[PDB]
């Protein structure tokens, strides 16, 4: 199985390295055959002689043009004849590219900024992460001794935790004595231990959490002061640091630094991304967080280390588990795109698409256009985004169904063969003209992008077919990922067309796919109504909600499945429509804000969450009261009554005590600081909570929990009357 590829330099010439793991153990394949190169568009195949003489200077040596050969390729369908220029060393290209592009007999140059290593992959047509190869994984994390003054990495590293398929274990110097804490000498010895564990367990993947910006950088500054060789490299090298915009990224040659943060940030949606926050949001279990402030003054005093150790041990036990959750998909994304898992894992969809098209270009012999120059790059970002979500049909509805197009946006691209190499193609006998915007897209020959999309959608169909018939979960979940990557890849093309740095940028395509989207949806929203007595409830690109006023949950469903067959045999080939689900009751409030309930309970809803970190107090409880009364009970004059019935209680000082202790932390520092010369509840009326305020015969609350908690929570959901009658008099 190919893990990755990189190149070393020997005698001035580049030597490619293929890191892999075949039937059991590590192994590097070397190849010094591959040659660097890039393209050039010349005014006349004559000046090739004036050009093959141009030279540059790198490292005080001299960069020359090795060999050269003319070739024929397909630049956006249209025939092109360019010269392929070969060089001796990858770092030659970047030192002479502009010099060659600046020549007079040169109109333009192409494919001159592609990581030599990646290039090799697309040419030899090698695909990483393939075959049935089980990679050994190891998770590690570290907690250090902090101090606000500290410049950086000043304090020493207290522990190094590591989880495996065998368990977690922590390595620290001071004493603890727990079955899971390893004995070492000093800080220097600890780091040394870890190192000896890694080289020892010889893992294929090193998993960390934000270890791209913290763990490695630290371990570096510490390995320097302590005079140690951090040889995690499968070759003996030390992690190599890299640029990633405003942040950084760390490699470990021969292995795979699978940092979970960038991957988790792209997948799950949350307002806070602490490991504890994450773990919770992923497996539904609580995570105990121990803060530095506490750690510092815990490893010094004496013991509390049994606590810091646990927190440490877990940090790594959690990271490992999350590792197995998110690596599988990102690993299939790899195999689908044709690049390292290291790369794909730290990549946005636009690039995942850019790597696909670059590879597919090589196969199809299509010359790739170039990336945009700053002037243009900026110009593209200036575009206007104007979402279109028809307004919700205010009110409560029953026996609602949801229908969404099976791959809407990709279906259009295919159906209407939308692509930059078909846009404004003169001399065609056939064309499709995007609604509104009116872009002419020649249908004569299938366009590049669309051609690819078709295959992709086709195969994922193949997969889903073979996936509803296998039984063996390992042979099913296996496939399950494949078709999810394909789906992920596909829905990524629309955005890619507008992604300002896209080689295959196409604003016209994007505009078109949007306009068609509208048209198609709208045509359905209408066709279902006038011909099937449905009343479109809510709607947003992709799908929509609907029902037939007053109709058994069966009639609606029976009438539903009917419509599908109708417009389906109606609409194009790709464009198809499917039954999403059924929600016995629900109401809608503005854009992406609503709530529904299925036939077996369960309140989905996603419309208007906006929690308060903790349960806030009474709000996070009466919130449910209402919703449940609105959906399940379906009693409008009840949930609102539930408010006026509670506003006549809390203001009257009746609602329990602990049900007011706002579980928050970091006025704000009122009671907070009011305990001086980490976190703690409070039930002011500016006042702290304990057995000192509430005698149930002297102290009470305040009239805020009614206008700053209970009320503001349901005020929105409650759509019909103003809160002027939610307090009652």
Q: Which stretch binds Ni ion (CB under 5 A): 138-146, 438-446, 481-489, 496-504?
A: 138-146
Helix, strand, coil percentages (3-state) for the chain, rounded to 5, are 35, 20, 45
Give the Cα separation of 355 and 349 in Å (integer).
Answer: 10
Binders of Ni ion in range 620-649 (CB under 5 A):
none
Cα four-point dihedral sign 701, 703, 707, 708: negative
Q: In the complex with Ni ion, which residue's Cβ is closer, 77 or 262? A: 262
Give the Cα separation of 360 and 154 in Å (integer).
Answer: 49
Q: In the complex with Ni ion, which residue's Cβ is closer, 313 or 513? A: 313
Q: In the complex with Ni ion, which residue's Cβ is closer, 176 or 207? A: 207
**Nearest partner of 208 among 200, 217, 199, judged by Cα:** 217
Residue 90 contacts residue 116 (beta carbons within 8 Å) = yes
Closest contact distance (angstroms) between CB of 246 and Ni ion is 20
Give the Cα separation of 422 and 508 in Å (integer).
Answer: 11
Binder of Ni ion out of 4, 92, 111, 141 (CB under 5 A)? 141
Residue count, binding to Ni ion (CB under 5 A):
1
Instruction: Burial-class residue 695 by CB neighbours within 10 Å (0-12, 13-18, 19+).
Output: exposed
Give the Cα separation of 127 and 50 in Å (integer).
Answer: 39
Closest contact distance (angstroms) between CB of 215 and Ni ion is 6
In angstroms, the Cα distances linking 92 to 39, 233, 368 are 14, 27, 21
Closest contact distance (angstroms) between CB of 367 and Ni ion is 45
Q: Which pairing describes strands 256-259 and 205-208: parallel, antiparallel, or unpaired?
A: parallel
Q: In the complex with Ni ion, which residue's Cβ is closer, 140 or 516? A: 140
Q: In the complex with Ni ion, which residue's Cβ is closer, 319 or 411? A: 319
Closest contact distance (angstroms) between CB of 226 and Ni ion is 20
Residue 318 contacts residue 287 (beta carbons within 8 Å) = yes
Q: In the complex with Ni ion, which residue's Cβ is closer, 92 or 212? A: 212
φ and ψ of 633, to 5 deg: -60, -35
Give the Cα separation of 178 and 312 in Å (integer).
Answer: 12
Q: In the complex with Ni ion, which residue's Cβ is closer, 92 or 141? A: 141
Closest contact distance (angstroms) between CB of 217 and Ni ion is 12
How many alpha carbons lie under 13 Å from residue 270 in its C-beta half-sphere?
17
Closest contact distance (angstroms) between CB of 278 and Ni ion is 12
Window 648-667: contact mask with Ni ion (x via CB under 5 A): --------------------
Closest contact distance (angstroms) between CB of 216 and Ni ion is 11
Residue 275 contacts residue 287 (beta carbons within 8 Å) = yes
Q: In the complex with Ni ion, which residue's Cβ is closer, 92 or 215? A: 215
Instruction: Burial-class residue 125 by CB neighbours within 10 Å (0-12, 13-18, 19+).
Output: exposed
Window 545-584: contact mask with Ni ion (x via CB under 5 A): ----------------------------------------
Strand-pair partners of 29? 18
Q: Which stretch binds Ni ion (CB under 5 A): 135-143, 376-384, 555-563, 704-712?
A: 135-143
Closest contact distance (angstroms) between CB of 303 and Ni ion is 22
Q: In the complex with Ni ion, which residue's Cβ is closer, 90 or 211? A: 211
Residue 644 contacts residue 725 (beta carbons within 8 Å) = yes
Q: In the complex with Ni ion, which residue's Cβ is closer, 37 or 216? A: 216
Window 49-88: contact mask with Ni ion (x via CB under 5 A): ----------------------------------------
Instruction: Burial-class residue 219 by CB neighbours within 10 Å (0-12, 13-18, 19+).
Output: buried
Q: Which stretch binds Ni ion (CB under 5 A): 44-52, 133-141, 179-187, 572-580?
A: 133-141
For residue 270, the 8-state DSSP code is -
Closest contact distance (angstroms) between CB of 253 and Ni ion is 23
- Which distant-in-sequence residues (6+ apart) come within 8 Å of 149 by Cβ? none
Give the Cα separation of 645 and 642 in Å (integer).
Answer: 5
Strand-pair partners of 21? 26
Breaks in the chain (C–N > 2.5 Å) following residue = 666, 677, 685
Q: In the complex with Ni ion, which residue's Cβ is closer, 260 or 631? A: 260
Closest contact distance (angstroms) between CB of 685 and Ni ion is 40
Q: Which pairing describes strands 247-251 and 240-244: parallel, antiparallel, or unpaired?
A: antiparallel
**Nearest partner of 544 among 514, 569, 577, judged by Cα:** 577
Closest contact distance (angstroms) between CB of 139 and Ni ion is 11
SS3 (DSSP) at 374: helix
Q: In the complex with Ni ion, which residue's Cβ is closer, 93 or 316? A: 316
Q: In the complex with Ni ion, which residue's Cβ is closer, 109 or 159? A: 159
Q: Which stretch binds Ni ion (CB under 5 A): 39-47, 137-145, 361-369, 557-565?
A: 137-145
Closest contact distance (angstroms) between CB of 316 and Ni ion is 9
Q: Which stretch binds Ni ion (CB under 5 A): 6-14, 136-144, 527-535, 708-716?
A: 136-144
Closest contact distance (angstroms) between CB of 237 and Ni ion is 23
Residue nearest to Ni ion (CB): 141
Scored b (16 or more CB within 10 A) or e, 134-155 reads ebebbbbbbbbbeeeeeeebeb
Q: In the complex with Ni ion, which residue's Cβ is closer, 322 or 627? A: 322
Give the Cα separation of 463 and 440 in Å (integer).
Answer: 34
In angstroms, the Cα distances linking 128 to 4, 22, 471, 489 are 7, 12, 28, 17
> Can you spell out the DSSP letters for 118-145?
HHHHHHTT--SS-SS-PPPEEEEEEEE-
Closest contact distance (angstroms) between CB of 163 and Ni ion is 13
Closest contact distance (angstroms) between CB of 209 and Ni ion is 6
Closest contact distance (angstroms) between CB of 197 and Ni ion is 17
Q: In the complex with Ni ion, which residue's Cβ is closer, 141 or 314? A: 141
Q: In the complex with Ni ion, which residue's Cβ is closer, 252 or 711? A: 252
Strand-pair partners of 109? 40
Q: Which stretch binds Ni ion (CB under 5 A): 139-147, 402-410, 432-440, 467-475?
A: 139-147
Q: Using CB under 5 A, list all residues that contact Ni ion.
A: 141
């Amino acid at each position: 199985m190919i893990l990755d590829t990189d190149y070393i330099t020997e005698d001035g010439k580049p030597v490619i390295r293929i890191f892999k793991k075949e039937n059991g153990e590590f192994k590097i394949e070397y190849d010094r055959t591959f040659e660097p190169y890039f393209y050039a568009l010349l005014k006349d195949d004559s000046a090739i002689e004036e050009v093959k003489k141009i030279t540059a200077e790198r490292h005080g040596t001299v960069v020359t043009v090795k060999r050269v050969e003319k070739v024929q390729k397909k630049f956006l369908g249209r025939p092109v004849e360019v010269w392929k220029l070969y060089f001796t060393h990858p770092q030659d290209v970047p030192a002479i590219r502009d010099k060659i592009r600046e020549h007079p007999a040169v109109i333009d140059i192409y494919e001159y900024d592609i990581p030599f290593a990646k290039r090799y992959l697309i040419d030899k047509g090698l695909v990483p992460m393939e075959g049935d190869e089980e990679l050994k994984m190891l998770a590690f994390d570290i907690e250090t001794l902090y101090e606000e003054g500290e410049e950086f990495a000043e304090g020493p590293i207290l522990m190094i935790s590591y989880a495996d398929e065998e368990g977690a274990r922590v390595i620290t110097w001071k004493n603890v004595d727990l079955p899971y804490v390893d004995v070492v000498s000093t800080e220097r010895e600890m780091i040394k231990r870890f190192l000896r564990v890694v080289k020892e367990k010889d893992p294929d993947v090193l998993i960390t959490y934000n270890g791209d910006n913290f763990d490695f950088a630290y371990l570096k500054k510490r390995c320097e002061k302590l005079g140690i060789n951090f040889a995690l490299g499968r070759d003996g090298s030390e992690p190599k640091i890299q640029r990633m915009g405003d942040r950084f990224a760390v490699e470990v040659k021969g292995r795979i630094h699978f940092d979970l943060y960038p991957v988790i940030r792209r997948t799950i949606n949350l307002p806070t991304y602490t490991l504890e926050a994450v773990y919770e949001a992923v497996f539904g279990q609580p995570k105990e967080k121990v803060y530095a402030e506490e750690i510092t003054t815990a490893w010094e005093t004496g013991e509390n280390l049994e606590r810091v150790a646990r927190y440490s041990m877990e940090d790594a036990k959690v990271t490992y588990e999350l590792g197995k959750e998110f690596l599988p998909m990102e690993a299939q994304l790899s195999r689908l795109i044709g690049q390292s898992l290291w790369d794909v894992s730290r990549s946005s969809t636009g690039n995942l698409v850019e790597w696909f098209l670059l590879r597919k270009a090589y196969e199809r012999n299509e010359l790739a256009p170039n990336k945009p120059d700053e002037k243009e790059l900026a110009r593209r970002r200036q575009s206007y985004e104007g979402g279109y979500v028809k307004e919700p049909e205010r009110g409560l509805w029953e026996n609602i169904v949801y229908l969404d197009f099976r791959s809407l946006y990709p279906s259009i691209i295919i159906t209407h063969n939308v692509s930059p190499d078909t846009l404004n193609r003169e001399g065609c006998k056939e064309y499709d003209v995007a609604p509104q915007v009116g872009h002419r897209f020649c249908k004569d020959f299938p366009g590049f992008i669309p051609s690819l999309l078709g295959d992709l959608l086709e195969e994922r169909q193949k997969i889903k077919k073979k996936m509803k018939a296998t039984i063996d979960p390992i042979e099913r979940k296996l496939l399950d990922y494949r078709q999810r990557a394909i789906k992920i890849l596909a829905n990524s093309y629309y955005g890619y067309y507008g992604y300002a740095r896209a080689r295959w940028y196409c604003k016209e395509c994007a505009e078109s796919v949007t306009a068609w989207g509208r048209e198609y949806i709208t045509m359905t929203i209408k066709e279902i109504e006038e011909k099937y007595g449905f009343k479109v409830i809510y709607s947003d690109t992709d799908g929509f909600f609907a029902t037939i006023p007053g109709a058994d949950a069966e009639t609606v469903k029976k009438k539903a499945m009917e419509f599908l067959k109708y417009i389906n045999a109606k609409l194009p080939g790709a464009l198809e429509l499917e039954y999403e689900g059924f929600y016995e009751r629900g109401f809608f409030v503005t854009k992406k804000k609503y709530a529904v309930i299925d036939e077996e309970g369960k309140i989905t809803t996603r419309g208007l969450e906006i929690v308060r970190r903790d349960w806030s107090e009474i709000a996070k409880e009466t919130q449910a009261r209402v919703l449940e009364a609105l959906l399940k009970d379906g009693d409008v004059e009840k949930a609102v009554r539930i408010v006026k019935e509670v506003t006549e209680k809390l203001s009257k000082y009746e609602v329990p005590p602990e049900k007011l202790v706002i579980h928050e932390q970091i006025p704000h520092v009122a009671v907070a600081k009011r305990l001086a010369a980490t976190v703690i509840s409070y039930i002011v009326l500016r006042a702290i909570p304990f057995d000192e305020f509430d005698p149930t015969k002297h102290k009470y609350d305040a009239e805020y929990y009614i206008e700053n908690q209970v009320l503001p929570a349901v005020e929105r959901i409650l759509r019909a009357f103003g809160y002027r009658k939610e307090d009652l008099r």
